[PDB]
Amino acid sequence: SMQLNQYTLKDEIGKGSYGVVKLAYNENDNTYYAMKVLSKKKLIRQAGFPRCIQPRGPIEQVYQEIAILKKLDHPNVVKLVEVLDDPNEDHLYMVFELVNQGPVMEVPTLKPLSEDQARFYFQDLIKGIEYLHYQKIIHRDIKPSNLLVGEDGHIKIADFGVSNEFKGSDALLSNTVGTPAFMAPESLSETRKIFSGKALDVWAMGVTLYCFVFGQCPFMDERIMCLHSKIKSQALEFPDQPDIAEDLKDLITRMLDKNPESRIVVPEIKLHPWVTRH
Numbered sequence: 001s002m003q004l005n006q007y008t009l010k011d012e013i014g015k016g017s018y019g020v021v022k023l024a025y026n027e028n029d030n031t032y033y034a035m036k037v038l039s040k041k042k043l044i045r046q047a048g049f050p051r052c053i054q055p056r057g058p059i060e061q062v063y064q065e066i067a068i069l070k071k072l073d074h075p076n077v078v079k080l081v082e083v084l085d086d087p088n089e090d091h092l093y094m095v096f097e098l099v100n101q102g103p104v105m106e107v108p109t110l111k112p113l114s115e116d117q118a119r120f121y122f123q124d125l126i127k128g129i130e131y132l133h134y135q136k137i138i139h140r141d142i143k144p145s146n147l148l149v150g151e152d153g154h155i156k157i158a159d160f161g162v163s164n165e166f167k168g169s170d171a172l173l174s175n176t177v178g179t180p181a182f183m184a185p186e187s188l189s190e191t192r193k194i195f196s197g198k199a200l201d202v203w204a205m206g207v208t209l210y211c212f213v214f215g216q217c218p219f220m221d222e223r224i225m226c227l228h229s230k231i232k233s234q235a236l237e238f239p240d241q242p243d244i245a246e247d248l249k250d251l252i253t254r255m256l257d258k259n260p261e262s263r264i265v266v267p268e269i270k271l272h273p274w275v276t277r278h
């Protein structure tokens with residue numbers, strides 16, 4: 001182990017978009033936490049060398065993550081509890097409440113969830129996302145591997161590393177970031193038309209739900225250009241087995257509407273018959 005202030009840093013427990021996450025024991029309160037450990041220089045470099053324009057100050061993104069996290073207080077969202085950041089040190093450390101069981105699934109898996117368990121987790125996901133959205137945050141990387149399961153069997157949305165805060169009613173984007181199998185079709189073409197950020201989160205929720213019950217994404221190809229083409233052009237299909245409920249198929253179909261103008265919205269998802277039954 002190593003010591004960092006009141007923390008003893010131990011095994012690696014996670015690795016997200018940036019940095020790495022270590023288990024951290026707090027000797028002041030006898031409690032374990034999750035500590036994300038980052039290099040400011042490395043983050044700068046990750047955005048690429050100075051010369052779709054690269055914005056000018058890339059270290060801004062981690063401080064924006066921090067500012068986002070400090071605004072969020074919800075049972076289905078991870079909780080930032082401390083930031084350690086010496087201006088004369090290259091490292092920056094973000095301390096979170098620990099969510100004991102870790103990610104709910106790493107796609108792909110041969111071991112999908114049952115429909116009922118998928119519903120339970122999905123209900124948590126809806127609570128967390130509507131709260132984010134209300135707080136004018138889009139997550140931009142919703143996927144089962146960013147969903148941590150607590151000892152209480154509830155999910156917390158994690159990894160705000162590419163999240164964005166918007167003003168007014170929605171984020172308006174020309175391009176976006178995301179895990180490619182989770183990105184919505186409107187974000188994958190070069191078009192003159194911007195797109196809305198909240199609907200990207202819904203598409204990703206849809207792909208997540210599909211993954212919850214089938215263990216793999218609905219559109220998949222190892223050739224990136226073919227993956228993008230399928231996202232844009234391939235009709236959604238469900239495998240023959242496992243044989244899910246028709247109302248779940250309906251919900252997924254609506255979340256995976258390729259047209260963001262008609263795609264289901266969160267307040268509607270909450271009231272969908274699949275969500276409200278048990």
Ligand SMILES: CCOc1ccc2c(-c3ccc(C(=O)O)c(C4CCCC4)c3)ncnc2c1
Binds near residue numbers: 021034096158159
């Ligand atoms: C066996 C327990 O495993 C974990 C792993 C990561 C945790 C994080 C955590 C804290 C930060 C981050 C991040 O990278 O911003 C992440 C990402 C890493 C991969 C999944 C999400 C996770 N926060 C709280 N609790 C955790 C528990």
